[PDB]
């Protein structure tokens, strides 16, 4: 988020880069879930406020913080 998402314009520089960080957050959920669940990041639209969408994933999989 620090390197691909731009605070001034409050948007991702490139949408292929948003895709990149979404694909990564999906892999956190795959790695840290015990059981087949529905994803917390359904649409990559949700990433457009990206600190809220990071907390959402690392609340539900707090092992990933550590």
């Amino acid at each position: 988020v620090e390197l691909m998402f731009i605070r001034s314009t409050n948007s991702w520089f490139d949408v292929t880069w948003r895709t990149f960080t979404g694909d990564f957050l999906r892999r956190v959920e795959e790695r840290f879930t015990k059981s087949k669940t529905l994803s917390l990041i359904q649409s990559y639209s949700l990433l457009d406020k990206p600190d809220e969408a990071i907390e959402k994933v690392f609340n539900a999989y707090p092992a990933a913080r550590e």
Partner: protein
């Protein structure tokens, strides 16, 4: 069909209720403390009954300690268990020296059929209105209904406080007005006994039927005993009226024989678990394999029951037979009656008659004329009323002749017939084709039954009133719940079934079409921003380091005086550990030991160990792939798909199992290669050897060989003369076919040991090298040399050892040399027990610290630990590897067989044991040990060092000891010399030692 299944040697007795009472009470205790069972659950009552039913002095001493040493301050669930407990102790004492009881206390369910919006048919058994107890169920059964018309409230605490319903379990409730007087005149109950009228029909008798229902009312309040009742029961497999009867019998301390068609480990375990939850004090359960379609098994079975324990029988004398075995025949109309129906007709009738015939012969034999056997015949009310049952109805209706034959033959003092007309019984609580319509029949004003209710009804025909009645005249019990009075039942049933299939099928099609209309009118923007994303889990394999609690919680555990009191240079502490053995690692073995099944992470490690899957990072057929991949087909495998793809294969090729020859250099215990010396009675046909090799034959044989240069080649001819010795191979068939082997595909390569090493070192060294690495990883020590930041090179020791060592290298230097096979020249150095430790030092540690290798046969690991500790306290080593390691080969397998130490596998198979259930410690039937292979390793340190390095600390090695026994002439006989660890003096034991009190000891410091 007619093949013999029964052997006496396959009979499994379960009788150890004294042990299963204590296990059941502890299992309830922790279930209540971990809030799995609450004070509202009925299972805490059900479970209480089964602990009362096994009440003895030992079990009260046990419950007193476990319940009078719970700190109720520690949480709300610790208050619950102490309140419940105190009660359960007060009950158990009241009922000590009182016969145990079948008392079912489960919530009686009804059937419920639901069809959703999309036309999916759901079946769910559903708590009834006004029937929330079995007391109530007997009232409901007595009143009958509007269609059965021929032309009382004891408050409890179920489902609010079960600790109060526990208090009321011994209190034997007496009632004035019995439920005989509830039965409204001009109405037939749902459960009723019949009476034969002189015309020769059977009619509802009101007065017989009262007696039955009054016994059933009391069974429900007070409960029934079956103490001293001996029972044969057939077709009592899992999910049957058979099996809910079996529970009830055992629950009243019956002694039951139970026959299974399909005898297996999976079944012998089902039965172990029923007996260990239900078998009350004095109960016993014998499980025999059995074919009721075999004449010769029926003859055998009753001979085994009646025969003396001395001639290998039981010594019993049956007080009830319950022959409920059946094969299901469906879609067999009268044009299709063939071998299956002819064979079924033998199970369900002629061999029933032959089994009652048999008990009459064995009872007469011994002049037993006053101890008859109640035969409970499973009758149908419906003979040919459905069809497509094959010879089922012809089978059932012919059992109705036994009611007459009892008066007309010579067997009434051995047998008593008690025909149960068993009605509509809802198979399981899932979707049986019959279940979905149960709800529909019930609307007629009729009753269907759970199997627990139909069990209850039939256990009422074993109460001492209807037993006393059976012994006068035969007893016809009608446990059909008014289905006689629904008219044209076949068409009525088939209406109901039509109208659910229609209503579902229609509503499934009208659903699918209204979701293709919508999809055409509104496209794939209304049905695509809707279909959600799912997340299949991957396998995060964890090291399972221990949970460190916040310091404030840690001071609560230990006494306050302990701070500053111990010298931690002189506390020893296990810092990591690992193993290679039949279930892989310490990680995977724990998942099998504790849980019996593998996790997603266990399947992946096992799959990885056995080389079923391999990692891939690059291009798979053009595509870029990063994941696991089938090691053979290189095809991509997901973690969720590992269990499906590979579990079966992992469980077949792990554990105790048949010896796999490819693992032991083609050792096939069925074909064990020896050589017999014979004398050449007549000269052999010459063969060519080198010069060297011929002189070697001449040197050995002398006169008895002739060797002659062939002058062209230079090669020599070798004529073995009459009187020369030869060795001709033969093959013993050996009776030890099973061993605990490392899982098939285990390979030191997958850990990353080089072929230089593999093709040099003995197999046992590879188990050790992997165990030492995987033990430093458990201690968070990825680079051994990191130790030498904290500790001098001379302060890491190895105090591990083997019982026999490099046993494959002894084959090399005794057998293979003798056969002039190629054997490495340094084979002798690999044999030595002190070399596995050499290779660990030479390839990992590079310590110049102690090496003290023990030999302790089967105790070498605990000796290792002892040598290890005393090396650390001596101040010779700060760190020490400690463990043991041993390989299974052909020759030790054999030598343990000659000592009769190991289980003979052919005896094991006579008893119908699979290789899994062949190691059974503490068991009645245990008959020798199961040879296995592998290594264990622990790392031990000073606690001082462990806290400085910040390595995990898995435990404290408080004590470790070794002891010889006494004068004897038997090296393999175990003894009691280890008792000397409890040696203390008790002459002067009136006042306390102040040295034991830690407070004193701290004041002195």
């Amino acid at each position: 069909g007619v093949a013999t299944s029964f052997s006496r040697k396959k009979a499994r007795t379960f009788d150890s209720s004294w042990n299963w009472a204590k296990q059941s009470l502890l299992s309830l205790y922790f279930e209540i403390i971990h809030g799995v069972l609450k004070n509202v659950d009925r299972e805490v009552v059900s479970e209480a009954i089964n602990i009362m039913n096994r009440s003895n002095d030992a079990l009260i001493k046990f419950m007193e300690y476990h319940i009078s040493n719970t700190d109720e301050t520690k949480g709300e669930n610790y208050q619950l268990v102490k309140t419940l407990g105190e009660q359960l102790i007060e009950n158990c004492k009241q009922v000590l020296d009182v016969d145990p009881v079948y008392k079912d206390v489960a919530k009686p369910t009804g059937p419920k059929t639901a069809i959703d919006k999309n036309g999916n048919i759901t079946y769910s058994e559903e708590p009834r209105e006004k029937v929330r107890k079995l007391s109530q169920y007997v009232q409901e059964m007595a009143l009958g209904g509007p269609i059965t018309k021929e032309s009382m409230d004891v408050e409890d605490a179920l489902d609010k406080d079960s600790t109060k319903e526990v208090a009321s379990l011994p209190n034997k409730s007496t009632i004035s007005k019995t439920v005989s007087s509830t039965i409204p005149r001009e109405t037939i109950p749902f459960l009723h006994l019949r009476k034969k009228t002189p015309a020769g029909d059977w009619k509802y008798d009101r007065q017989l039927s009262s007696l039955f229902l009054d016994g059933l009312e009391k069974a429900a309040f007070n409960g029934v005993t079956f103490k001293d009742k001996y029972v044969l029961i057939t077709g009592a497999g899992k999910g049957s009226i058979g099996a809910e009867v079996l529970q009830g019998l055992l629950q009243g301390g019956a002694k039951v024989v139970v026959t299974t068609s399909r005898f297996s480990k999976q079944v012998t375990d089902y039965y172990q678990s029923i007996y260990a939850k239900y078998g009350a004090k004095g109960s016993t359960l014998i499980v025999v394999p059995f074919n009721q379609g075999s004449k010769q098994d029926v003859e055998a079975l009753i001979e085994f029951i009646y025969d003396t324990e001395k001639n290998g029988g039981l010594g019993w004398d049956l007080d009830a037979i319950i022959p409920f075995a059946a094969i299901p025949e469906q879609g067999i109309e009268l044009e299709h009656i063939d071998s299956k129906s002819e064979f079924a007709h033998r199970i369900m009738l002629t061999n029933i008659l032959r089994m009652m015939g048999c008990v009459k012969k064995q009872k007469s034999a011994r002049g037993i004329e006053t101890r008859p056997a109640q035969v409970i015949l499973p009758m149908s009310p419906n003979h040919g009323t459905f069809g497509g049952d094959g010879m089922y109805s012809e089978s059932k209706l012919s059992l109705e002749t036994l009611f007459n034959r009892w008066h007309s033959e010579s067997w009434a003092n051995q047998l008593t017939v008690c025909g149960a007309i068993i009605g509509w019984t809802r198979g399981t609580g899932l979707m049986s084709a019959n279940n979905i319509i149960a709800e529909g029949i019930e609307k007629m004003g009729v009753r269907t039954f759970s199997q627990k209710e139909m069990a209850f009804n039939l256990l009422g025909l074993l109460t001492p009133e209807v037993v006393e009645l059976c012994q006068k005249s035969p007893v016809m019990a009608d446990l059909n719940g008014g289905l006689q009075f629904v008219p044209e039942l076949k068409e009525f049933t088939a209406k109901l079934r039509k109208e659910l299939v229609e209503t579902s099928e229609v509503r499934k099609a009208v659903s699918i079409e209204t979701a293709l209309e919508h999809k055409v009118v509104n496209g794939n923007s209304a049905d695509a921003a809707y279909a959600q994303v799912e997340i299949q889990p991957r396998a995060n394999i964890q090291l399972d380091f221990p949970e460190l609690k916040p310091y404030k919680q840690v001071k609560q555990i230990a006494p306050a005086e302990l701070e500053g009191l111990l010298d931690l240079e002189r506390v020893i502490v296990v810092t990591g550990f690992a193993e290679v053995g039949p279930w892989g690692s310490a990680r995977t073995r724990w998942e099998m030991e504790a849980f019996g099944e593998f996790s997603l992470e266990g399947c992946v490690e096992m799959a990885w160990i056995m080389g079923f899957i391999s990692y891939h990072n690059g291009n798979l057929k053009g595509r870029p792939y990063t994941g696991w991949v089938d090691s053979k087909t290189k095809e991509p495998v997901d973690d969720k798909d590992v269990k499906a793809k590979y579990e079966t294969s992992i469980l077949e090729h792990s554990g105790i199992r048949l010896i796999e020859p490819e693992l032991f250099n083609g050792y096939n215990p069925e074909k064990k290669e020896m050589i017999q010396e014979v004398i050449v009675e007549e000269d052999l046909e010459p063969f060519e050897a080198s010069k060297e090799t011929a002189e070697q034959f001449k040197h050995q044989h002398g006169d008895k060989v002739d060797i002659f240069e062939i002058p062209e080649t230079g090669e020599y001819s070798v004529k073995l003369l009459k009187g020369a010795t030869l060795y001709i191979p033969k093959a013993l068939r050996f009776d030890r076919l099973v061993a605990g082997q490392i899982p098939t595909g285990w390979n030191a390569k997958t850990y990353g040991i080089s072929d230089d090493i593999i093709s040099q070192v003995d197999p046992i060294t590879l188990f050790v090298l992997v165990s030492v690495v995987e033990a430093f990883i458990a201690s968070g020590i990825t680079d051994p040399y990191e130790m030498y930041k904290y500790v001098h090179v001379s302060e890491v020791g190895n105090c591990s050892g083997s019982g026999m060592g490099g046993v494959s290298a002894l084959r090399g230097m005794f057998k293979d040399r003798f056969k002039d096979e190629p054997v490495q020249n340094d084979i002798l150095q690999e044999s030595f027990i002190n070399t596995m430790s050499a290779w660990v030092n030479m390839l990992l540690i590079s310590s110049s610290g102690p090496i003290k290798t023990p030999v302790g046969a089967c105790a070498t690991s605990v000796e290792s630990v002892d040598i290890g500790v005393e090396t650390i306290l001596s101040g010779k080593a700060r760190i020490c590897i400690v463990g043991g390691y041993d390989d299974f080969q052909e020759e030790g397998s054999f030598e343990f067989g000659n000592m009769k130490a190991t289980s003979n596998t052919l005896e094991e198979f006579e008893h119908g044991r699979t290789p899994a259930e062949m190691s059974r410690p503490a068991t009645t039937t245990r008959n020798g040990f199961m040879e296995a292979q592998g290594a264990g390793i622990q790392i031990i340190m000073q606690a001082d060092l462990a806290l400085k390095m910040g390595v995990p600390i898995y435990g404290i090695v408080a004590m470790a000891a070794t002891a010889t026994d006494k004068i004897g002439r038997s090296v393999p006989a175990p003894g009691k010399g280890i008792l000397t660890t409890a040696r203390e003096h008790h002459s002067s034991v009136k006042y306390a030692s102040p040295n034991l009190n830690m407070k004193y000891r701290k004041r002195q410091l």
